[PDB]
Write a protein that binds this DNA or RNA. Structure first.
Lengths: 63, 47, 61, 60
DNA sequence: GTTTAAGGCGCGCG
DNA sequence: GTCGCGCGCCTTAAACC
């Protein structure tokens, strides 16, 4: 799918098996604003491709 | 998902709850596993 | 708030039986849904308001 | 109504660049987006405005 | 003193 | 008849610099 989803999918995959990160972390390490990051994460989520542990902030890993 | 599978079997307006149905449709389009070519009615199929 | 008690008395006013949707809660009170949900969600922070999830979410005490 | 015309008035009059977001229209006019967006998406189908895309969408 | 907040929001829906 | 809608989102207060 997308460039941005590409990059996000790279980073999460490389963290490890079950390692999870935040939109904030991603935002910093990819140089994109959090708004974009979240936009995509929530998409990939609705797409079954990722998993959100809900809280403050939510945690994102692969399902 | 239980009620998503059901719709797939068939293969666009279906006689079980029709509000709850459209949610599950656009989901699997956004989600994938379905095509949505525009016009009225919206047409649906496996890609 | 003026609306908070009003939102309360309306939920409160129509028994303990059931919650209602922000939509109608708006339409009857003549107040827009934006203002309504703001307050509902605001109140649900505090214990009185009680939110039962869905589309649309249902609001009771 | 009253609102359609003002909004309607706003675009050309303040045609600086081209177009603005429902949000801006709101803030200027002191009116929530619901009424505004109703009127914009309305004025589209029938022809007097163009939705140049984005999030939020822009109207000219 | 920016940034977060579920903050992702695009929504107009009768 | 298109309708998927869940939306509260700052007339912002708590929280991390």
């Amino acid at each position: 799918g997308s460039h941005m989803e590409q990059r996000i999918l790279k980073f999460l995959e490389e963290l490890g098996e079950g390692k999870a990160t935040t939109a904030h972390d991603l935002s910093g390490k990819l140089g994109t604003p959090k708004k974009e990051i979240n936009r995509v994460l929530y998409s990939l989520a609705k797409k079954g491709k990722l998993q959100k542990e809900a809280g403050t902030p939510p945690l994102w890993k692969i399902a | 998902s239980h009620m998503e599978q059901r719709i797939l079997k068939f293969l666009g307006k279906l006689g079980t709850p029709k509000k709850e149905i459209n949610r599950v449709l656009y989901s699997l389009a956004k989600k994938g596993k379905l095509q949505k070519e525009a016009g009225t009615p919206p047409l649906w199929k496996i890609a």
